[PDB]
């Protein structure tokens, strides 16, 4: 899976509210 940046970025997380790893 190698992470680094594949562990979300592009997978959506707008920031309104929170609870999605980017915010969470
Ligand atoms: C800038 C682009 C960078 C690309 C880097 C190369 C990615 C090649 C595709 C890898 C797909 C499979 O991945 P994975 O089985 O979860 O990991 C590899 C795990 N082992 C080493 C133990 C087999
Ligand atoms: C590039 C480095 C990261 C690789 C991480 C791999 C983790 C193991 C994935 C195992 C599941 C294999 O199904 P996939 O092909 O993913 O399912 C997508 C198939 N369609 C396109 C037809 C919908
Ligand atoms: C019309 C063109 C069709 C041919 C090109 C598309 C081939 C199908 C996709 C190739 C595999 C891409 O796996 P990935 O996103 O690195 O794995 C993500 C793994 N998880 C879902 C578990 C996070
Ligand atoms: C002729 C065909 C050539 C194909 C070349 C494919 C290269 C894929 C490389 C994927 C590397 C995945 O990251 P890693 O293993 O943790 O980094 C290793 C970094 N060093 C080598 C400096 C230790
Ligand atoms: C043209 C742009 C050149 C940028 C050069 C920046 C300095 C790089 C120093 C080398 C160490 C850092 O990078 P790396 O762990 O090998 O890469 C993956 C980095 N991320 C985890 C954030 C995705
Ligand atoms: C298929 C034809 C093209 C083959 C090209 C083969 C040579 C590729 C050399 C690539 C040199 C890149 O630097 P590095 O130290 O390994 O970065 C390591 C970066 N990670 C920590 C994110 C894994
Ligand atoms: C403008 C878009 C061009 C697309 C074509 C090129 C795609 C491949 C990018 C590969 C570079 C990604 O560098 P990184 O792993 O973050 O740093 C690695 C830094 N060192 C080499 C010093 C270890
Ligand atoms: C070019 C055509 C695109 C069409 C897309 C249609 C929806 C397919 C949904 C596929 C869901 C599984 O993949 P995923 O874990 O989200 O993908 C890899 C993303 N990350 C590296 C950030 C984990
Ligand atoms: C597509 C139209 C052109 C847009 C140009 C925007 C430039 C934004 C520059 C601000 C930094 C963006 O940092 P990031 O992407 O999160 O990290 C990339 C990290 N390295 C540079 C080391 C690879
Ligand atoms: C894997 C595909 C993900 C597509 C996500 C599109 C969201 C709408 C962006 C519209 C503005 C142009 O785009 P960008 O801000 O330069 O790129 C997206 C950068 N993030 C992934 C960090 C948000
Ligand atoms: C084989 C030729 C190369 C094809 C490459 C296609 C790339 C499609 C990118 C779709 C948008 C993905 O979101 P992004 O913000 O740009 O993701 C990088 C995440 N950081 C900004 C944090 C570094
Ligand atoms: C050498 C030529 C390189 C060409 C590189 C092309 C990169 C194209 C990246 C396209 C990323 C598309 O993801 P997205 O916006 O979320 O669409 C999927 C939207 N639905 C789930 C609603 C269907
Ligand atoms: C002709 C040789 C190939 C050229 C390169 C084409 C690169 C196309 C990249 C397409 C990337 C598609 O986004 P993804 O994250 O996997 O979508 C999964 C669903 N979300 C966007 C919602 C997370």
From Swiss-Prot:
There is a cross-link at residues 3-7, 13-20, 18-23 (Lanthionine (Ser-Cys)). The modification 4-hydroxyproline is found at residue 14. The modification 3,4-dihydroxyproline is found at residue 14. The modification 2,3-didehydroalanine (Ser) is found at residue 5. The modification (E)-2,3-didehydrobutyrine is found at residue 2. It comes from the Bacteria. The keyword Nucleotide-binding does not apply. Maturation of lantibiotics involves the enzymatic conversion of Thr, and Ser into dehydrated AA and the formation of thioether bonds with cysteine. The C-terminal lanthionine undergoes decarboxylation. This is followed by membrane translocation and cleavage of the modified precursor. Occurs in 2 forms, A1 contains 3,4-dihydroxyproline at Pro-14, A2 contains 4-hydroxyproline at Pro-14. The patent report does not provide the stereochemistry of the modified prolines. One of its GO terms (molecular function) is signaling receptor binding. There is a cross-link at residues 8-11 (Beta-methyllanthionine (Thr-Cys)). Keywords: Antibiotic, Antimicrobial, Bacteriocin, D-amino acid, Hydroxylation, Lantibiotic, Thioether bond. GO terms for biological process: defense response to bacterium; killing of cells of another organism. There is a cross-link at residues 21-24 (S-(2-aminovinyl)-D-cysteine (Ser-Cys)). The modification 6'-chlorotryptophan is found at residue 4. Belongs to the type A lantibiotic family. Lanthionine-containing peptide antibiotic (lantibiotic) active on Gram-positive bacteria. The bactericidal activity of lantibiotics is based on depolarization of energized bacterial cytoplasmic membranes, initiated by the formation of aqueous transmembrane pores. This is Lantibiotic 107891. It comes from Microbispora sp. (strain 107891). The lineage of its organism: Bacteria, Bacillati, Actinomycetota, Actinomycetes, Streptosporangiales.
């Amino acid at each position: 899976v190698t992470x680094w940046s594949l562990c979300x970025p592009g997978c959506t997380x707008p920031g309104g509210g929170x609870n999605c790893x980017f915010c969470x």
